[PDB]
Nucleic acid binder design. Structure first.
Ligand SMILES: [Ca+2]
Ligand SMILES: [Ca+2]
Ligand SMILES: [Zn+2]
Ligand SMILES: [Zn+2]
Lengths: 344, 548, 547, 345
DNA sequence: CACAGTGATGCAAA
DNA sequence: CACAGTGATACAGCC
DNA sequence: TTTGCATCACTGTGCGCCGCAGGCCAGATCCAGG
DNA sequence: CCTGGATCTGGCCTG
DNA sequence: CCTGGATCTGGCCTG
DNA sequence: GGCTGTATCACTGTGCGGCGCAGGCCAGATCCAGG
């Protein structure tokens, strides 16, 4: 585990806590900039390019049939292999939550310049409310695909929201939604094994299962060490959703998940408590039925990450994490965040 | 023996603190014997009547998404924003009143003036008609607000104030609307009441919407309701018209979903380009609004006609972000005056350097022209050189005597006559957007605004074509295009300016230094309370008892 | 019913302007019907009693080159400096008092203080003996004093203020010198009386000498004379002693004819050099004075021994200019605290990144070490990161809690022991030069300053060899080598500091905008008169009437 | 006359109003810097070097037998052919006037680096009081040399000076002093043709005459258009000093004098009134007995010199003037003064 | 060991 | 056509 | 009931300087492929 | 083929 | 031998 | 006669942003030209 510091070019102030890195054909891209998109990059999607420890954000255009999407600040991202990305929820820079589904895919590729296609999908049926901090995954059962959405954080409903507590959030219901990307339908399922709400959790996707571990609840204000396997069966009739509580979970919130090897995942970062930060990493090795979470060695954290209060970041896709640290008391300029790159 | 309201008015209007009023009261009591003033707890009890959250009020029908509790005063400006370690980090201290509580406190302070206006307008006294209150809302960030030591967030060194000012109260009597109130000094610091004080950057969009969204929620909630208030023993009904005009152009571009000032779409009132503004220069109409900006953001975001970036930007006319604050399309008079003065300063530097004859010049030539202009302005106009154009430098610079001083430094005579007609046209056009009622105190100058604007535009196109060929400033286009339309709509520019908000910004630093606790968790509540208490019209009448 | 002196004290001490007082008086008289306060012309009539130029005095022998008139008040600080186009140009607006008139008025507004002080020492109130009055003179330049528009000279945006402070008054009774008065708050802004205000750079030597030379002439005339003053109905006899301790090191070096701060001769009190100060660090004695500096400038100018420029500078020890104000060899405690705090800040930054093990480093990782220290000091000690170090940051940084917070960022415990020992020694040594009477407040901490300073010097030489081998800062040498001699000479160091003049700079910044006319020709007179009235003890005793 | 603007290097702030340029072997030097001499140049004497319109002030060392002199701010300079310079009076940077006489001469010259010798001369006899704004010249009569000093401005005497008027100046007495540089003696002479005091005047030296023209008096506060020829005879006995009033004088104060040709002098700059500046130049052609002052053409003054209030400057010696103009307002940096160079054929 | 505020709160005294 | 000071002076009104 | 005074963690005066920040847009500038 | 000085340049002391 | 775009860079609008 | 009130004078500040820098001194590279 090698930790390496990365210098950023003339646009340090676009990376904010809550960005999301997507991966297309081995190239890394950027989404969720700070503020509304400027005239130098009207789309907000950037070319995440780190080479010899220097980061350059280059603009990326859209196709003519695209929808120009706002920078969402805490969405639910998943890959869907023809290879594309599904995003749901998030925070508009005016601090309103969205319920749209955008599908990002490569329209045409030229010599080191990529044009994207962003399509907004209609969602009818038992739709989820606008939220953030949730997760989405795609499962494959009997030659069909389905999107499994678990709950996150949202505002109070419109008959319960006062202006003295306008920005107060509450955890969503623990229902599980099955999102079909062919027709844009969603059905909810009440499962008795899921009683508490959950947010900022990790969700690993096997063939027909979704392993949901970690998270943080707002009602009891603890981070439970629970692990749930959501098995989805897809017959010709209605689907069958079955949750199963397993031992071996970890008390984890806002962690970063990467896939270094096939059927092998690494949990990096997160928060175990409020004032206490999680400096250990967890190695998750999937199987056909059983999973196990073991210890790996602690990477050599520097002196400014061990004494930082918060971090953020996401997964670049090549078994490599891009995490950030708040800089030298912001001030005017001179870099507000200290970025790093961790390899596995 | 003085009443505690009188000692409260004397303490807050003469800028005395509690620690200095205590010394004055203690010395007056210990030397004269009998207690002339009142102690501090009597003044603290007396100021609770004037703060918001004291009087009973009722909305009809009840406002959406607010509580009907009437004893709400200073609350946290974050509005329950979650400061957990997993979410977006907050570094902001904010305190505010509720909007309806601030409105009922302002109306109950203005009670005596409203009754006096109903007496003096040949009206009745127990009338309970639908009063229509017109307010003026303002917002401006500040800089060099140095944060303190101690425990708390990593707060930036800026501040953002939101204020309002009750401008005009009418009543329906018969068919005509008569005016029972009108503010005599609208750009004063005495009537700009504070509403929300936060410590964050004005360019940090996420924090700005996260604090200012409950205010726009309450404002949109009470934009379509009727407030019943017992004024002098009789319940009376109040409708409100909110008019946000106390903003500079940069904040209007930010909160209206428009691009920055260096773009090709230059005007926040019409859909023109900078090239087309320098060719027509007069003939433009006001077309932009808030609903149009919301529809144009939805067109940009959905992209229904399947275009690229440039065609979609030409379709939506630069609206590439969602607006979140409804503002009035108008002109800030103070910043327009400052920008026009800075443009004339650049014209004066270019005309003494013979740029119209020599189009090329080095940088030391421009520095020498600036040095000659600064030395001769100190010699003739007694104006020291400043690098940031003020308003007093603007009021002293736009004179014909300054044109005579600068024309002493120009060898040619046709350039002398060109600058003389330019300043004559500017001084013929300036009293329309600075006077509080140009249909009464300068109606001939209002009537000849379009003719003088066309003459000014022709003079800029002909005699200064080395500077205004294919480009123009935004404030020149605002001054030459939309001013008679804004006068025909609103009745006044300059009354609705952001100058009283800047005078309140002058008061803010004084109250932060010498009228508040020096703690990071306590400064904003004390400054908000004392600035609300300073602008009380009930306490300002005790300081005018001698002329009564 | 209030007397106009009481209303004047109320208007002055509560920072009330004349317009706000007129508003308050107008509304109190309008709502009460009585006349509680007094109108402003009565305050102006009672105001002239407290200003210089009112009492008769007499000198014996009369002062040389000083007038005999006693009704002089606020005079022009240029002193008839020629301003035509032929000669050297002027750029200042200066107003001042005469020195003798200001000292007579300052002695006369503390009349009841002197009478009660000679009552409490079991003496007689009709004594006319020779009173010895020692004062403390201070001068400091200011920046960001913004120019005004209008007619007048091309004024700089800086200001220089000269002030004095009566410290203690002493009567000779019997064989010993018993003291009558003693200033209880010496570094307060209630006791620093303004003397001359001017608008110039302190680094403009010609204009500074041209304005300050009449004051030095009056002071040199009064250094060897005697003042008769009718106090309490009995004529008393005063003689004066002037102590110029309210100067920082830069002004002392500029004015006393010495070299600049980065020179190889670092001490304004002795003749050591920076290398031999970096080798000895404890063993020095105060040698420099005003007369010796005048003799050394005459040796430099005449060159009697026919030497080169380097041998002449070695003989003279850096006195390449002529001194013109007599100052005493003391140490400013406020800037000593600020400089030692900045030195310990640099020590903490260099101790985080381990320069003792890796001596070479780029500036980017140095900025990284500074960022780490700033973040951890904001987290632990609640200290906001400052650019220019001030006194409150020095008071909060010089704690054992701060070094205990810093010791979380450095790996080795040898450096923990070194830093904790260094901060313990510095906190053992600091109340000797901060207290106003170390012989009574901390005599145990005073009597072992030599052992603690030798231990501090050895710890700097051994455990911090990577920074303090061959170079040492000026205030460290001043702190470690001199202050037992200064406290043996005077009795205190922190009382003679210049914190009162900085509080007066704060008062000047307030009075320039709130209690003065906004004119170039009228601001200095109004600020000087109001700052004189604010410092009046006769008005300050009116506000303590609850006793 | 060609007027040309000169850029100065990293030490703009040493040139102040009242500097003096001396000339040695065709090289120009500098004296009278602002403030006391620093450690980069402990002598205060600089190498005035203008080439391709750039000015570089390089330090100049002294010899081992020299006296290290203060920067005098308004002295009386004259050349005395070894070739040397005599300076008298001036203002110390502590604003005290000096009565010393310093003799500046070249001690040794190397490849473009000159070492000076500054000697202080004792003055006994009827000595002049410390003053500034005066003049000194050397006359040659019958194989002997004598220094002719005329009056200037000084402070009030020690029995008449008050601290309320400490910096008030008064014009000196109109006596003429004959300074001998061999023995250091000075004798005064009361002449009835000189009644008013004079300061900042021009003094041209022929063989045995000194032509004193221009000036400004403090008592009546006018600039008189008077011209005096002071003829000095040097016999074996006592000298004979005779003044003579001539017509043709000009109302001139603080002017700059250069010698372009032999027996031909040019008056550049000065002040005719207080608020009025003198933009004309005067051509003085000496003879054996008669002098005449005629008009020359006005040089092309730029827009910042015609609207300046003050100037200063002195003579470089090659028929070339170096004059300065107060920095365009000054923002406390980026050159506080604008300098020029004026050539005369 | 700078020092005179800065205002709300709490408790003792009148 | 920003507006509420900033203090000394001068003159009118009044007791 | 109404007065009076302690208590709490902080403030400022302790130095400088010039055009900047932010964003947008058209013209050089240059590097490698139709 | 040195090498002996002129001369930038950056670091360090006080504000 | 072009030449067709990527991409710095400086000037101009509001504070 | 003496005490009180009010106009007059030409100006103030709030209207924008940043980082270390100014001044001086001294030692160490750095470079250019004479044997
Ligand atoms: Ca602002
Ligand atoms: Ca200072
Ligand atoms: Zn328009
Ligand atoms: Zn020493």
């Amino acid at each position: 585990m090698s930790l390496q510091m990365v210098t950023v070019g003339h646009n340090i102030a676009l990376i904010q806590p809550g960005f999301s890195l997507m991966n297309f054909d081995g190239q890394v891209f950027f989404f969720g900039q700070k503020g509304w998109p400027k005239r130098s990059c009207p789309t907000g999607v950037f070319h995440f390019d780190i080479k010899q420890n220097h980061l350059k954000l280059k603009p990326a255009i859209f196709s003519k049939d695209s929808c120009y999407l706002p920078p969402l600040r805490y969405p639910a991202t998943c890959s869907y292999k023809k290879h594309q990305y599904i995003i749901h929820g998030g925070k508009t820079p005016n601090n309103e939550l969205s319920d749209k589904i955008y599908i990002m895919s490569v329209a045409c590729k030229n010599n080191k310049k990529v044009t994207f296609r962003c399509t907004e999908k209609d969602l009818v049926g038992d739709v989820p409310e606008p939220r953030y901090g949730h997760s989405i995954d795609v499962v494959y059962s009997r030659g069909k695909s389905m999107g499994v959405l678990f709950g996150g954080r949202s505002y109070m409903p419109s008959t319960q929201r006062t202006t003295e507590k306008w920005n107060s959030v509450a955890d969503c219901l623990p229902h599980v939604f099955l999102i079909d990307f062919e027709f844009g339908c969603a059905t909810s399922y009440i499962l008795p094994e899921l009683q508490d709400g959950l947010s900022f959790h990790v969700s690993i996707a096997r063939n027909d299962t979704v392993y949901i571990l970690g998270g943080h609840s707002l009602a009891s204000n603890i981070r439970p060490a629970n692990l749930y396997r959501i098995r989805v069966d897809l017959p010709l009739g209605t689907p069958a959703v079955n949750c199963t509580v397993l031992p071996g979970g970890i008390s984890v919130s806002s962690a970063i998940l990467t896939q270094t090897n096939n059927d092998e995942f690494v949990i990096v970062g997160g928060y175990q408590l409020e004032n206490q930060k999680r400096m250990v990493c967890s190695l998750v090795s999937l199987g056909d039925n059983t999973i196990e979470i073991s210890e790996m060695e602690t990477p050599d954290w520097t002196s400014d990450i061990k004494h930082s209060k918060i971090w953020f970041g996401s997964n670049m896709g090549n078994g490599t994490i891009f995490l950030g640290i708040p800089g030298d008391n912001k001030q005017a300029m001179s870099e507000a965040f200290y970025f790093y790159t961790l390899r596995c | 023996g003085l009443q505690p309201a009188v000692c409260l008015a004397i303490r807050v209007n003469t800028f005395l603190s509690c620690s200095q009023y205590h010394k004055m009261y203690r010395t007056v009591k210990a030397i004269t014997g009998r207690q002339i003033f009142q102690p501090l707890h009597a003044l603290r009890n007396a100021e609770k009547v004037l703060l918001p959250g004291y009087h009973p009020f009722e909305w009809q029908p009840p406002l959406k998404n607010v509580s009907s509790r009437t004893d709400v005063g200073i609350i946290d400006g974050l509005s329950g924003l979650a400061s957990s370690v997993d979410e977006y980090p907050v570094d902001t201290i904010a305190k505010r009143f509720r909007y309806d509580s601030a409105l009922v406190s302002a109306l109950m302070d203005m009670e005596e003036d409203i009754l006096e206006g109903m007496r003096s307008q040949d009206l009745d006294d127990y009338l309970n008609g639908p009063f229509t209150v017109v307010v003026k809302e303002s917002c401006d960030g500040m800089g060099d607000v140095s944060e303190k030591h101690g425990s708390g967030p990593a707060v930036p060194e800026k501040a953002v104030r939101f204020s309002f000012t009750v401008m005009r109260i009418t009543i329906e009597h018969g068919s005509q609307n008569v005016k029972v109130f009108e503010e005599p000094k609208p750009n004063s610091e005495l009537c700009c009441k504070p509403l929300c004080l936060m410590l964050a950057d004005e360019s940090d969009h996420e924090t700005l919407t996260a604090i200012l969204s409950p205010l726009i929620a309450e404002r949109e909630a009470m934009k379509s309701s009727e407030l019943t208030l017992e004024m002098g023993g009789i319940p009376r009904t109040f409708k409100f018209i909110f008019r946000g005009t106390g903003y500079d152009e940069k904040l209007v571009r930010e909160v209206e979903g428009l691009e920055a000032s260096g773009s090709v779409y230059i005007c926040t009132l019409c859909d023109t380009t900078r090239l087309e503004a320098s060719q027509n220069l007069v003939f433009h109409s006001i077309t932009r609004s808030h609903a149009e900006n919301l529809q144009r953001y939805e067109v940009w975001r959905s992209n229904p006609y399947h275009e690229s970036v440039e065609e979609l930007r030409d379709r939506v006319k630069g609206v590439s972000a969602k607006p979140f604050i409804e503002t009035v399309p108008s002109i800030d008079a103070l910043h327009c005056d400052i920008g026009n003065a800075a443009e004339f300063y650049k014209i004066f530097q270019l005309e003494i350097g013979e740029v119209y004859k020599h189009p090329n010049a080095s940088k030391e030539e421009r520095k020498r022209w600036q040095a000659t202009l600064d030395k001769h302005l100190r010699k003739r106009m007694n104006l020291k050189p400043i690098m940031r154009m003020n308003g007093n430098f603007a009021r002293k610079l736009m004179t014909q005597e300054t044109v005579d001083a600068v024309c002493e430094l120009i060898p040619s005579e046709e350039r002398h006559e060109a600058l003389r007609e330019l300043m004559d046209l500017y001084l013929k056009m300036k009293p329309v957007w600075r006077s509080s009622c140009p249909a009464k105190e300068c109606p001939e100058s209002l009537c000849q605004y379009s003719f003088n604007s066309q003459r000014f535009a022709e003079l800029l196109s002909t005699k200064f074509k080395y500077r205004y060929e294919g480009k123009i400033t935004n404030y020149f286009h605002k001054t030459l295009a939309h001013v008679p339309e804004i006068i025909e709509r609103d009745g006044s520019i300059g009354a609705w300016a952001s100058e009283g908000n800047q005078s309140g910004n002058k008061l803010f630093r004084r109250f932060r230094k010498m009228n508040a606790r020096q703690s990071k968790c306590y400064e904003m509540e004390d400054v908000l309370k004392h600035h609300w208490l300073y602008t009380s019209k009930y306490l300002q009448k005790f300081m005018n008892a001698h002329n009564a």
